[PDB]
């Protein structure tokens, strides 16, 4: 009866639990993965796994998981939920026929491609360029990381990347700004943070909320929200004016340090304490203590940075403090991350190629005379990255030309992009809207044609390359064959690619054919790659290794400390003076803060019975004294109403103090209105449905979300089905 006493088959497999992509071993018995585990050699898991990685396999064995292609009954509205089963052949023909029509009267740029996850390489990076549309985007760019990637390209000549390059093991003093570690549960960084604490690493947390990471800190600074750049500028001032900075380091690796000293003249710990609300002595003491530890003192940059409209300025300032401490490329906090060598599969150049910009004209030069039609959000902000949230307007008004047709490859249209009403207007006006997914979410059931993808355990994917201290390559192999009428994304892309004239792209007849070519290059074949799941190569991490060779890394030959001559010129400001006092909540309201549950990924894990049973609903955090003046207690429920009248389903109230009186906090990803995902339907409040407005970062395409205010209205406890009853439905592969 037990699975481990029964016959098993293992395989080396990547976790699709989230984008960290940990290397794992999957244990199957017949057509079912019972257990998954981390493995030692793999630099990401090293034998361990977070809760999301452990429970991730049940979506494959979920009775509501999508099985057949589906096409929208003719004459029925998008939203209304009327579908009829179809054949892979019939559904794939129907999409190409429709796509070709949009291309004869509008051009190929009238098709937007949105996507996320491993297979976003096919849908967002490859298919779109081979087809000729520049309107390809992912939420991890303008709804996450854009502010810090832009700041980093200008200041250093490098990205921060997916596996942020912090030398945690040698760090001695660490400053976290809104970075919640322990709730944000990315595997390796949990391990590393825990090892730092263990060796006597003292941690300072800056956050208006007493989080899990603050529960492990030597100092908690309860900062007034949207005020971090004033605290960063005043620390820059203390290290420059009290003469505590690393003199040599600035002298040999830094351009324009002088502009910074003069800029920061009046931003004193007394000017900061006034806006920040942190005492001036504390502001001083924290900068001194970090100077006393250099180069082994780090402010690691957080991942989610869209917070307010000014964002690229706050990150630039955080990076200057790291530079002034002399820590970049030194053991203490930043090693230097090099990408591995795995040669691309040989092909003709793509109609559109990318521009990994940073200096000397990376905006619209190739978009003006260069061939025929630029990405539709081209004049809205300074930076060159595509912003998912800005290409939605073109579908409603037809402004910058028209975008009829849209693809959604594993990306939550109604939970990951703000202003849900505007996104629904835009789907209304489209000629074609295709969605490739696994569960019947609220935005998948608005599509003309639904295509069921095969899950990470029943699928092969192109390799996963990770820039790192020791660069590496990972490979995922099926643990068993797809279920029902399910197909892998590499297969769905090639099948559409042959139907739209792109045979030169997609020549190879199979994915193992494709995988054998890149393994030839390195000195191996498919069977040997399956043997050592992961491959580590030689690279570099300090400055010495670079230096002795007579080279340096960057952008232009010396990190430019103020940081970018060509923005200055035509945009306006060079330095981060935009501490820009933030608009405040109206009386009777609270700022809406949000974040992660250690056990749930974004939105997609809310139908998972193993994970919902650990955390079945979110809970609103209000200060103890506010819930008391309001007439709220421990087990009460409440509706959240925003400044624009939108109400979000009943949520449990959480009157325990660990938060300022200015705010309120809820975990992101609950509040689904999707009846077909039977255990996620009707539970908690959705933060995204309340985020009606956003402040556009004019520098890094980012949509500032922490600009919404919400008030609480007493509500009745909800009457919902039993979760155990639903979780007990047996899984039948029919």
């Amino acid at each position: 009866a037990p699975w481990y006493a029964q016959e098993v088959k293992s395989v080396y497999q990547i976790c699709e639990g989230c984008f960290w992509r940990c290397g794992i071993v999957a244990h199957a018995v017949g057509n079912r993965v019972y257990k998954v585990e981390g493995y030692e050699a793999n630099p990401k898991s090293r034998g361990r796994l977070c809760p999301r990685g452990q429970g991730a396999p049940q979506t494959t064995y979920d009775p509501d998981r999508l099985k057949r292609p589906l096409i929208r009954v003719e004459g029925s509205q998008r939203g209304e939920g009327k579908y009829r089963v179809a054949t892979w052949e019939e559904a794939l023909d129907h999409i190409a026929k429709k796509m070709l029509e949009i291309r004869e009267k509008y051009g190929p740029e009238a098709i937007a491609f949105f996507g996320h996850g491993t297979g976003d390489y096919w849908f967002v990076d490859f298919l779109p360029a081979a087809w000729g549309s520049p309107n390809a985007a992912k939420p991890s760019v303008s709804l996450c990381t854009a502010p810090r990637e832009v700041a980093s390209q200008w200041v250093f000549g490098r990205p921060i990347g997916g596996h942020e390059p912090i030398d945690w093991e040698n760090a001695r003093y660490i400053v976290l700004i809104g970075h919640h570690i322990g709730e944000d549960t990315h595997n390796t960084q949990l391990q590393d943070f825990a090892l730092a604490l263990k060796n006597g690493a003292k941690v300072v947390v800056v956050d208006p909320r007493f989080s899990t990471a603050a529960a492990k800190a030597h100092r908690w600074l309860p900062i007034k929200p949207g005020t971090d750049t004033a605290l960063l500028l005043a620390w820059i001032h203390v290290l420059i004016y009290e003469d505590l900075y690393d003199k040599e380091y600035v002298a040999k690796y830094t351009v324009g340090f002088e502009e910074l000293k003069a800029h920061v003249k009046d931003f004193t710990p007394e000017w900061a304490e006034k806006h920040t609300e942190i005492p001036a002595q504390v502001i001083r003491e924290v900068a001194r203590e970090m100077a006393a530890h250099k180069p082994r003192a780090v402010l690691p940059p957080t991942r989610h940075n869209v917070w307010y409209g000014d964002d690229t300025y706050r990150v630039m300032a955080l990076l200057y403090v790291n530079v002034l401490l002399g820590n970049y490329g030194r053991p203490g906090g930043f090693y230097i991350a090099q990408s591995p060598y795995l040669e691309k599969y040989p092909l003709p150049p793509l109609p559109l190629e990318p521009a990994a910009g940073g200096c000397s004209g990376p905006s619209g030069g190739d978009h003006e005379p260069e061939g025929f039609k630029p990405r539709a959000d081209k004049g809205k902000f300074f930076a060159r990255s595509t912003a998912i949230q800005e290409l939605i307007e073109p579908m409603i008004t037809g402004e910058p030309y028209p975008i009829k047709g849209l693809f959604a490859y594993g990306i939550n249209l109604f939970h990951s992009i703000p202003n849900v009403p505007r996104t629904k207007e835009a789907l209304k006006n489209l000629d074609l809207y295709v969605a490739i997914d696994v569960l019947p979410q609220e935005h998948v059931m608005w599509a003309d044609v639904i295509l069921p993808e095969a899950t990470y355990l029943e699928r092969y994917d192109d390799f996963v390359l990770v820039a790192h201290k020791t660069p590496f390559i990972q490979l995922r192999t099926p643990a068993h064959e797809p279920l029902f009428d399910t197909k892998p994304g590499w297969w769905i892309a090639r099948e559409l690619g042959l139907r739209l004239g792109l045979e030169q792209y997609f020549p190879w007849k199979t994915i193992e054919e494709y995988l054998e070519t890149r393994l030839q290059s390195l000195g191996l074949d498919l069977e040997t790659m399956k043997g050592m799941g992961t491959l580590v190569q030689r690279g570099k991490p300090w400055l010495e290794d670079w230096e002795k060779e007579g080279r340096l890394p960057f952008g232009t030959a010396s990190g430019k400390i103020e940081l970018y001559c060509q923005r200055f010129k035509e945009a306006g400001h060079q330095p981060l003076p935009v501490f820009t006092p933030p608009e405040e909540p109206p009386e009777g309201f609270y700022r809406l803060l949000y974040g992660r549950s250690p056990v749930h990924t974004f939105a997609r894990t809310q139908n998972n019975w193993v994970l919902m049973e650990m955390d079945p609903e979110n809970e609103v955090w209000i200060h103890k004294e506010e819930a008391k003046r309001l007439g709220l207690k421990e087990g009460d429920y409440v509706m959240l109403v925003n400044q624009d009248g939108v109400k979000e389903g009943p949520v449990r109230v959480k009157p325990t103090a660990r938060i300022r009186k200015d705010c309120v906090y809820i975990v992101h990803g609950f509040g689904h209105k999707a009846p077909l995902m039977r255990l996620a339907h009707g539970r908690g409040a959705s933060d995204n449905y309340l985020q009606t407005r956003y402040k556009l970062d004019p520098i890094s395409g980012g949509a500032g979300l922490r600009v919404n205010f919400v008030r609480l209205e007493k509500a009745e406890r909800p009457r919902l089905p039993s979760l155990t009853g639903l979780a007990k439905r047996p899984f039948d592969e029919r």
Binding site: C50, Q191, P598, T724
Partner: protein, 193 residues
């Protein structure tokens, strides 16, 4: 011959239920029940704010009140210190549930009583328990209490403080909590409101 135990460092625990999900998976524990869960409690106002994250599961008590009270002989204590159930003798009378002071046991839907097993299935073939292997923070340790080299023995030797739940029942738990966050010790519902 060994005396089996588990040590959890609370100074490192962050309450990401990884261990709780790994056990659910490894042991096929049905939907409405749990061998392992995490409790989280805050203590105090503004300038002295402590948060305690605490995993709870069978403590494999050395003096288990859950054994003598069983009519059939299904409930038994092993020579190495493991408390287990022979489902072949279990009549699902619930006497052991009435007697356990830690809400560690349940009625499995197959008709018999269940609970944390110290992964006896893995122990017998020389492996460490599922909770212990999957743990980002490395706060749990396991071993023979009598071997000065084992990971639990070392962990206890290096600890600033050691605590156990409801020590005044006289069960002698073999799941030890290290370096508790609050000066007054493990958190109780009675020290609230």
């Amino acid at each position: 011959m060994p005396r089996y135990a588990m040590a959890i460092d609370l100074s490192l625990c962050v309450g990401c239920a990884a261990c709780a999900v790994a056990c659910k998976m490894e042991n096929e524990v049905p939907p409405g029940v749990f061998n392992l869960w995490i409790r989280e409690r805050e203590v105090g106002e503004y300038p002295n704010l402590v948060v305690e994250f605490r995993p709870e599961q069978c403590l494999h008590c050395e003096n288990p009140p859950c054994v003598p009270v069983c009519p059939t002989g299904a409930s038994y204590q092993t020579k190495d210190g493991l408390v287990l159930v022979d489902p072949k003798k279990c009549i699902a009378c619930g006497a052991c549930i009435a007697a356990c002071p830690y809400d560690a046991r349940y009625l499995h839907p197959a008709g018999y009583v269940s609970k944390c097993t110290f992964c006896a299935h893995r122990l017998e073939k020389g492996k460490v328990p599922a909770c212990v292997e999957t743990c980002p923070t490395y706060c749990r340790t396991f071993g023979d209490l009598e071997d000065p080299e084992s990971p639990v023995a070392k962990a206890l030797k290096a600890a600033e403080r050691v605590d156990v739940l409801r020590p005044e029942q006289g069960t002698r738990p073999k799941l030890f909590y290290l370096n508790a966050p609050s000066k007054k010790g493990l958190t109780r519902e009675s020290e609230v409101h």
